[PDB]
Design a protein around this ligand. Sequence first.
Ligand SMILES: Nc1ncnc2c1ncn2[C@@H]1O[C@H](COP(=O)(O)OP(=O)(O)O)[C@@H](O)[C@H]1O
Ligand SMILES: Nc1ncnc2c1ncn2[C@@H]1O[C@H](COP(=O)(O)OP(=O)(O)O)[C@@H](O)[C@H]1O
Ligand SMILES: Nc1ncnc2c1ncn2[C@@H]1O[C@H](COP(=O)(O)OP(=O)(O)O)[C@@H](O)[C@H]1O
Ligand SMILES: C[S@](=O)(CC[C@H](N)C(=O)O)=NP(=O)(O)O
Ligand SMILES: C[S@](=O)(CC[C@H](N)C(=O)O)=NP(=O)(O)O
Ligand SMILES: C[S@](=O)(CC[C@H](N)C(=O)O)=NP(=O)(O)O
Ligand SMILES: [Mg+2]
Ligand SMILES: [Mg+2]
Ligand SMILES: [Mg+2]
Ligand SMILES: [Mg+2]
Ligand SMILES: [Mg+2]
Ligand SMILES: [Mg+2]
Ligand SMILES: [Mg+2]
Ligand SMILES: [Mg+2]
Ligand SMILES: [Mg+2]
Lengths: 438, 439, 438
Amino acid sequence: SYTREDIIRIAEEENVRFIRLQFTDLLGTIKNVEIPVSQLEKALDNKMMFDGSSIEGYVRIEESDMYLYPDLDTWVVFPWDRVARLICDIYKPDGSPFAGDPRGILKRVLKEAEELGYTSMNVGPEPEFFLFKTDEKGDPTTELNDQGGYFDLAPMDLGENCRREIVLKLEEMGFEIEASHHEVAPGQHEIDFKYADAVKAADQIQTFKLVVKTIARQHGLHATFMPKPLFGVNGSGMHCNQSLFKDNENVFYDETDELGLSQTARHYMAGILKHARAMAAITNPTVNSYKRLVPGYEAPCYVAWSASNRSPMIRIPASRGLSTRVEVRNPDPAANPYLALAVMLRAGLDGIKRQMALPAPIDRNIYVMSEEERIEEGIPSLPADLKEALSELIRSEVISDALGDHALAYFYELKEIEWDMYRTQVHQWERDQYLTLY
Amino acid sequence: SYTREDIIRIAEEENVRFIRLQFTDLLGTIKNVEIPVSQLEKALDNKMMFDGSSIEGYVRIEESDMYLYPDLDTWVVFPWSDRVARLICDIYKPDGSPFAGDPRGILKRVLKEAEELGYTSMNVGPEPEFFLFKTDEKGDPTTELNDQGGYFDLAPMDLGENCRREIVLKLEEMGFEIEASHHEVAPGQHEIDFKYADAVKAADQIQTFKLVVKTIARQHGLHATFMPKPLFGVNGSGMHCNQSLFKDNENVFYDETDELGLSQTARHYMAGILKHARAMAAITNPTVNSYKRLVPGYEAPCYVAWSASNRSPMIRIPASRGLSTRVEVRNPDPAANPYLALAVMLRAGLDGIKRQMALPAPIDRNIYVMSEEERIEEGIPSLPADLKEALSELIRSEVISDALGDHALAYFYELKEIEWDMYRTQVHQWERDQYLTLY
Amino acid sequence: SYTREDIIRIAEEENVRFIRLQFTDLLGTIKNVEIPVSQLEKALDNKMMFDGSSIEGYVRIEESDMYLYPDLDTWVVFPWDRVARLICDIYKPDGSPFAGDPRGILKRVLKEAEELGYTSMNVGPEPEFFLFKTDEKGDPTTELNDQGGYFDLAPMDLGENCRREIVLKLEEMGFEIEASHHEVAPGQHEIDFKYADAVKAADQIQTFKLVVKTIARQHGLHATFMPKPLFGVNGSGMHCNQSLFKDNENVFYDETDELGLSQTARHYMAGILKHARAMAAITNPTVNSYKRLVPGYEAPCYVAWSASNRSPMIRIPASRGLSTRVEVRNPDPAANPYLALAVMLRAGLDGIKRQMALPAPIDRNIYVMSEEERIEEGIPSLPADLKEALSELIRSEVISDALGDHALAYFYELKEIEWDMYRTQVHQWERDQYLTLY
Ligand SMILES: Nc1ncnc2c1ncn2[C@@H]1O[C@H](COP(=O)(O)OP(=O)(O)O)[C@@H](O)[C@H]1O
Ligand SMILES: Nc1ncnc2c1ncn2[C@@H]1O[C@H](COP(=O)(O)OP(=O)(O)O)[C@@H](O)[C@H]1O
Ligand SMILES: Nc1ncnc2c1ncn2[C@@H]1O[C@H](COP(=O)(O)OP(=O)(O)O)[C@@H](O)[C@H]1O
Ligand SMILES: C[S@](=O)(CC[C@H](N)C(=O)O)=NP(=O)(O)O
Ligand SMILES: C[S@](=O)(CC[C@H](N)C(=O)O)=NP(=O)(O)O
Ligand SMILES: C[S@](=O)(CC[C@H](N)C(=O)O)=NP(=O)(O)O
Ligand SMILES: [Mg+2]
Ligand SMILES: [Mg+2]
Ligand SMILES: [Mg+2]
Ligand SMILES: [Mg+2]
Ligand SMILES: [Mg+2]
Ligand SMILES: [Mg+2]
Ligand SMILES: [Mg+2]
Ligand SMILES: [Mg+2]
Ligand SMILES: [Mg+2]
């Protein structure tokens, strides 16, 4: 790991002139202040301050002073006067860590895993995105960047150059990129990168979204991670591939098993399934998230698992060994990555600690099953809208405890205001259906 | 009470050349075929047919032949060239039995349950509010309301005076007893009140009222709508259903010894309305948009409660006594099928009487500003928050399900489940505005 | 006076098909419901009801039922199926008169005058108005109907036909019209009518405004009684000419006096002056009212009186006998006529009852006096804005008592919301002055 002295040294060597101190609000939005390198020693002394009452989910105006403590291992130089980055943890002025810090929330849950002997939670996220064209002014239009489809080539796929420049920038920043391709829906794109320990994976999701939007704009496009920008075509998921490790060993892997899944893996999966409905408000946190969780678009809407199957909530991909993993498919890229990893880890650990029995897999296209069949086989549904998910979240002591009292209370208040504003709108669909009929 | 010979005579007297045979589909939409007067004897002979598979909620393509039996007492000439009259018809199957899914037959069935308990009439006074929108050169509505006036305003703040006045003149030529007309609370919103009538006639008059309003509004270059909530942030349109039971000429809801003038029968009736309020919401508030009106702060109900002279609760008792003593059920909106709405409210009320239900305490506050904590304290239930929740309550209610009958219930549920599922998968512009640049 | 039986009879004789039951909200806005003549007997039985929670200043949603009791002497037929009118008083369902009814408030103050022996308060109001052109859609533009001036003729004055049709309609409705002319500002107009007892004068102001706006629209124009629609030109006043009578005798008249003013007249004037600042919130009730009360436009802004002088708050016109009167010039036509007459009568009566000493007149152009001179002669200012006027209103027990507790509390709450909304706006003037300067 880097020391204080290492950062000073490297900042001079690479001639860094500016440093961004970055952190994440409750809703997952990245935030930063930029300081000249003359201030780097002040920043490393943990003395930078900000207004916590202007950051969503943090504190109130009457006790608004908060501090940034940089995590020196997050040091990296931006490719696009040299600018560098430090991701920071949030502290109160009395020196204690801030309970509502999403990154601290993940670290707290990860300590629970370490005490059970798991040295790391490895996470490979797949944050899909759409690219929209922009007008003369630079705002997004309703027109997608192309009308291509899954694995298409140019000129059907017009995202090749934009995705490739994203990849080159991510690689200069230390990402191990695995693949790049057009996704199923028009104007939809995917760039995959190697799994990493959970905190780093969530840091990389934040950085990934930032690089994607920055490069998209240089190409005259607008990138969005909105879960379902368009009816009738695929939405964008952020599948969270997960495994637990003991130093070097993927403990989810058992070569004697049919699917390569250890008993620990199956208990973990059972925990994800058990608490699926209760974590949905965190993994699928917008009104629009539930427009993606509709049947027929390779997004889940029922609580089930199956191997090599893209209809259920959990897929077990058809590979084994170090790549043995649980693919939880319901999160979308609007989820706060720190909170989403935290609640899924706590749900998985509860499954392990209580040795929860794994339900039988649903080895079929779950979308074409009737409600009758779903009831016969005891297949629950994911929540149908944000309000229902929120009601399940507050009733869950396991998921509530993951979040802690502060984030839970702020998250619920924000989302109840969001839902009440949505629910009272009169949408154009209603005018089209009813204005001339009634 | 008109005979066939009366209708023949009157059509000649008035020089009627065409007759509309009118009826109502399951969702409340009026339907008709127009016949020349040369065909009137065939129509009075109950021989007119139609395709029941093309009328929402009736029958399937493989069993699609259906008959119209005119109700002779619904005869009226339209006042607005070659004279046109109408008859409202009941729906019959080719074997001669009345169609189980006919909304007008459904209300008549429930009314017979009232008659056997001694009540000779259910008197109903509906207040169907509506908006007037301007139209473009092609005649379709724009987003602009006809005016920006408000409650009881005068011209030129209220620009609907002439349109409302001509509606009133046409309705009175058609035998309506008009009581009042005024601008309502929201911009471009209007109200025309007419005297209560027995339930079937009241529902027939609701169907006729909506037709005349839309026809005259179009003559004035406007588009009338009974959509419950066309615009966020201003009042929606309700159809308050004022209700009383009579024994020949006596209003059995009236008791002068009572502080509000309500008899014990009225109080039991109200208790049945409140008991079944959530279960009949899908009928009285049958669209997705209905539930954007059932939000607090706009004189539409949100919570299941009653109060005197209070416009915040579900039931208001107006500060009138005597023949005008009544129960104002405020939650229906003018998208409700009037025959089905009256049928389920009547059934709920009668169930409250047969079971001698205890009437909850009144909520004598602005219920909108009560905290959720206070509302649980008093045990005030909520109306369903959306159409899907309303449908779930409907199919679980034996009392409301049996008001509708097996046929209408099954078709209503199938239609509305499809409607809900279509709405719930849409991505609305609000979502793009909130999320496309934030995420 | 008319009886119930008289109204039924006349309604049949003149073939009236519809009746408007009219009344006035707290802010002076006329309101009505239209009933078919079949309902006339119900209306005369005092059984018509309305939602008092939708009428500004009346009652709350939880006790919203209110009743209309028509005043049979207000019967009149509209000129423009015959429609008639009845002005109504407001009652609660328990049968008591509604304390917040502006017309009942005036009648209550008038009872105070009758007990002192004055049989009527005669009031001649001069409600000036502007006419604006309208667009293709019918909304007002910024363009006035003409660019004429005081007493101008066509084609400089383009309001002649519109004013003349207003006059003809008012005369068919029983008005005694006295004069019609273009006023000082472009597009500004005046129609005068004979004084009447106070309640009738206020009824006639309501009817006058309605006829003016109706006929203006038939001519493709928009009439407004806004006090000051345009900077730098005259605003619109509603001068309230006032006198007290004993049966037939103008008690303000004394032929032995220099100005023809009785001692009663001078005490009344002293009361108006004493409470000028305290009644301003009622006589000048909008934010815009105080844009008219600026110097140089024949509107008052200082508390003073003078004969044949159009600079002060009170003018004594140069005529005597039955036309001896006190012209209170500060009210504008946005004032509720019932409340405005009520507070000025109560102020005048307080002057009589306390035999208040009349200050010396200010026989000069008061606009060109320096602040120093104004202080030397003890000339107070009218309030500078609505907020200051409201603060003076609540501190006045004489004017507060005129209004009664209900109207006072609703009026203050409405106007404090109005003022707080105005005071936080950022106006274009501020952008023009400061956006490029700072
Ligand atoms: N043991 C593991 N634990 C967690 N993630 C893993 C593991 N092995 C591989 N992954 C990651 O899972 C993700 C798979 O993404 P992708 O190749 O898009 O899969 P698919 O499209 O089949 O879902 C990659 O980020 C990959 O690095
Ligand atoms: N006994 C009664 N039963 C049913 N309806 C009645 C009865 N008495 C009056 N009504 C009706 O109730 C309705 C009241 O409507 P409206 O006058 O708009 O009342 P509000 O606006 O006060 O709710 C009218 O249709 C009236 O005829
Ligand atoms: N004794 C009186 N009391 C009240 N008003 C009066 C009396 N005599 C005349 N008036 C009225 O005063 C008003 C004078 O208006 P106007 O002729 O426009 O006067 P000016 O333009 O000079 O102010 C008229 O309504 C007139 O009828
Ligand atoms: C072909 S897809 O299966 C698309 C998934 C969809 N966009 C969703 O999760 O909403 N995803 P993957 O990258 O896992 O193969
Ligand atoms: C003033 S209002 O109270 C408006 C009610 C509202 N439009 C609704 O029921 O949605 N109705 P009413 O005619 O009963 O007085
Ligand atoms: C010439 S004017 O003096 C105009 C008065 C001005 N409009 C005002 O009172 O604001 N009025 P009047 O009709 O009294 O002669
Ligand atoms: Mg993938
Ligand atoms: Mg994918
Ligand atoms: Mg995947
Ligand atoms: Mg009404
Ligand atoms: Mg109404
Ligand atoms: Mg009503
Ligand atoms: Mg004048
Ligand atoms: Mg003048
Ligand atoms: Mg004057």
